[PDB]
């Protein structure tokens, strides 16, 4: 049907319609062993769907899909919670489309039902070929879409392909003011024919509807790329548009990726085997060969480094002017002796095949090194001319082993880094290397992703996180991606922006990867 | 009613009775805003209650309470899961008491309903003063107890005092065989009058019915008392009947306790301020005074140490024969210079008030230390004559600050320690201290407790954990207490028992603190 | 009759042909092919005793019939045959797990599923309805199916002398059970009955000593594990580790020189075994020629024991001066080469010139080598697929195929001297042949009768799909004699937790 | 049918059942030249069959067959004697299985009818595939 409500002041109308673009084939549930009814009050209340908020404005509708949601129990909060203790489900949902339109705007919206195994077109013209419903910004407030549960079986087990709701702009938004926006909110409630099938213990791989983040401050976060230094501040740099690190790379799906580990402190120390020969032109740059306890046969499919070993950058070919600093000793017997700060770097300069690379072979700048002895390596700083930027860029990774892929934030927003201050190691005698102060940035702390593992991310959504500072305002707002990085909308460049690490993360909602954060941090200080 | 079933072979009978010791006053739910019905199949199935398993054998019933369970939605698995999305509840439960009795045994059981705000007596004779039901081991298989929901209000909000089921042995078990036991299992299902009241978002402080532990191996666990060394093995020592550590002390309720921290690697390094004077008789044992960034005014209510600082033991008064080893440098400018392995210990020997104590003041064994300069301290080993036992016993804690209380395992079971091998720091020149190899044990890794925080422990129960080794058998079985330690039943002494750290923890069930683990590890190798 | 989960008759309107069963198959209760298990006082609570997929394999007749049909539908009726006693008490839980749901490892979680409490006092002759849970009209092959899980709820305690309760499931398809789409009877479901060919053990080849006939089945209390890479076969992928189906043809290998002479023993010269099947030196491929010897000598040994092989120089179309030389794996100074099943070996002979290719035919052991030393194979490292170390369940010991290697005595300076030694193998390929020809039921273990003396003496062994036989034994013995002239007779399919009633008395 | 008798002293029960695992197709004897009836008292008395005694104890059931008897006039003593003066026979037999069991023992027995030209399996699991 359709209901028309005259707005306050009689300057327009408001249409609230109920539409069923596709007739529903109600499953008889004949093969369902049990038909588990829901709480009748679940049908009667409408909850915001995860990822069902979008803002239509100018510079919108070049062909984009505003929201695309699978018709499933995950739409409603209470059905999503209930499904954890159930094995099957059936029945459609009542999709309520809240539109914050105005009588003095212009433009149209189209929402369509897309059956399973059908790709979503990137054109409203094609989208009109689906069971659809046209919406006008001048008079719309709420479209109740009776979304059917399209299926060729009596009830869904987990993993089945499901129908989708796709909403995109049909005609571009127009308004006199350039700042006008259209808030679009979608809420769901199961249809009265919705049922669950078997009672099962509430342990599932399905993501929790709400992720509860412990109020752990960022300073209590271990820095994967600098375990011995606490995280002191959250960092944003417009220059750092790309991360290639192998440490601090944790993914919601397949655990720690690249060379990352869940115990950065325990995996920070590594041992290397000494061999004869040195870098050409530098007789004291003795070659070393890192031990691979997890890859004893040195399979190319396995990482050519110990797990969690340092991935700091030292420049392309910069052995003359900068290096890496590690504590180096020799294991005499039941321990290491004569441990001192030595000078080291990856590769051997010149050949780009293995220099500035994350391979097995390294060199240590001291003549007393003798072969084939085992030597301790604890990377602890940079010495010659290294700054924050050169240590930010990790050495490249080659081969067939599963290294962490290079990632970049979507255009318009920057990475948020866990920044720690690495102190310098000054020396007054000739036994040191006289390191230099430097800051180390990591994409992501292991523990917060660990907290995310228990709940999990709905597929496929990114977590919108509120970062609360000193009891309420100011509240910063970030997006956490399942790939293991966190971003924020920015204006300006401000290479060196600082956010205090005294706050705590608070889960806000699930949003699409293309969602724009309403709260934009101004880089310009 | 009562049903008598003749056993197979006619060598006895089997009584399955339904009893209602206390009549139920069904709440009219007149003030309930909504009455949310449950899935009818929830009423029809019986699930094992958390902590509702006990084994009656010989050396039982000296007055003990076998099980004591509050009548609440937490009894049933599905009601416990459902209650997370509800604000109130009402109605009783159908408590099914499975008894694995035999016709050729002897003894009796008594189960009673105890109203709220009434203490549980430790005598069956007193327990007969409650609404009770007598059970005989010869003929019992299942008593259905209609447990009422005793209340003076229409429905329960969270936090209300609830009635209890208490089961204890009425007459001692007797059998010809000395190894005979009585498995006692209790299962619950809500009564048909059970209802929920308001629909609320499923975010509550209530503990999850099932705790999902990630399959993180113990070697990937950070060692709080030795962050730089990975956990290599799980350790059991019959001698270690008491732990007084301030690191590795994490509690499900109030976070990290004592001096423990969630980032052991980041808090391992500390700085001290040098002052004039040395320990009497040792001019080179220069006094040092640890900096307290979190306690700048040095309030006695706050810890007199930096968070997460080393709590290793060095003996009562043993400065002559053993010490602690730390890397010590002086912060010249923007970093520390001349960092070398130095010799240090808590207190100043002699006075027990501050020596072998966890207070602010320490001494460092070098003459070149000058005051009042700031010095780096990274504890990394022990030098003189320290062994595993002396480092196991942490220095004592005094004052009004909230230090981690000394804990001991209940009689019959021993602590399970996260053991790591700390390598020695040998020196060939005169600039070292020549440390000694030693092992460091911690009660509990921070991350596993962190995983426990998301789910939480039901109050008040301990988690029974299966430790699976190399794909199934052998499966070791431990109890994890909310205070932050893990135990196991043992036979023998075997000071130095070793359990591989390659497994993973798997949650089994919730049990009472007094529960005896069926799987007993034999200490004698 | 108890039904934890109701049966929903699946109409079968979409079935092309509804193939009705023989009506007498419904009326005859038949033992479940694999639903046999034992409960003992040593069985830990919460341990899974029986995992049964609700499929046409629950009944002997339907299991045989299913090989002709592409689809099926309908549940089963299960009857408990509990050989209980008057003295034991305990509980069992039988839960119905719907498809695509993981089986929990604790009784606490298992009680969440539809279930039934089985008390040994009254569990006998109790009827269990095994529902067919599906959202489709009928099942195809390879579809996920519901499970029947039987777990110990209360441990079996006895008021008298301890007894082991034996429980057998008996099944009959429910009257709604139907088949669809007749297909040729070559389908993948394992045969409910396995017909072992009549062949004595002594007619089988010893994988770890092809040249020596197996003359004994051997049980040792001290062999708690097996790390061999030879004689390792599985029902699923056949030969595993470095095992081969032609041990005799794969026994000989060749090696090449290195220009090295071992640090400490100049007479010991290394060698690099060539890998015709691994010429690209792939770490993920075995760094050993296929089927090559995996005898063990010890750790940091060599001054007291080695391996003996026939070594010759290949000149042209043959070999030069084949003589018994004395060899061993890896070096003798580093872990990862010594006592490691890898490419590098050393041969004790002064004359081993540059880049020459030398034949290697392992033949025995020398020095202070013992049966125990050769029993333990060298370790395996790397990412190449090697056979995992296996151990029998507690209370059961491996049954070995024992051979008698004769010594080789030399009265001159040419050649070395060997010591008599016995070599054991987990399994000859001959027995497994028909086994994976017919297949094993999912998760079940073949119970075999070793018929001896024409039937007067019959030993019972459990043949695991992983490729070893275990025997229930009492007492301890460093070596047990079993004649190899008998033959194996298939008894039934049992769960791996089943305890063999007939116990071998080792201390005789 | 089935009859349950309570043992003396009430320390157990005793089941005496009558079972017909395979329905009998009674021959009409249409081609029989004469149908020679037996003494009615022969049907009424039960005689021990030759070879129909076995002792089940420990070290038993490794797969063995305790007894295997052909259904023939040789089962009964009087029918065996009578068959000597007769050329043909038809009809089944009432096989009574005396078991000296006790309530405080454990174990089970399976008895099956095996049709002609079918080999006897050496496994109880296979034997369950017969009318048993």
TrEMBL record, chains A, B:
<dbReference type="InterPro" id="IPR004005">
    <property type="entry name" value="Calicivirus_coat"/>
</dbReference>
<keyword id="KW-1035">Host cytoplasm</keyword>
<dbReference type="GO" id="GO:0044423">
    <property type="term" value="C:virion component"/>
</dbReference>
<dbReference type="InterPro" id="IPR029053">
    <property type="entry name" value="Viral_coat"/>
</dbReference>
<feature type="domain" description="Calicivirus coat protein">
    <location>
        <begin position="1"/>
        <end position="260"/>
    </location>
</feature>
<dbReference type="InterPro" id="IPR013643">
    <property type="entry name" value="Calicivirus_coat_C"/>
</dbReference>
<dbReference type="Pfam" id="PF08435">
    <property type="entry name" value="Calici_coat_C"/>
</dbReference>
<keyword id="KW-0946">Virion</keyword>
<feature type="domain" description="Calicivirus coat protein C-terminal">
    <location>
        <begin position="401"/>
        <end position="520"/>
    </location>
</feature>
<protein>
    <submittedName>
        <fullName>Capsid protein</fullName>
    </submittedName>
</protein>
<dbReference type="GO" id="GO:0030430">
    <property type="term" value="C:host cell cytoplasm"/>
</dbReference>
<dbReference type="Pfam" id="PF00915">
    <property type="entry name" value="Calici_coat"/>
</dbReference>
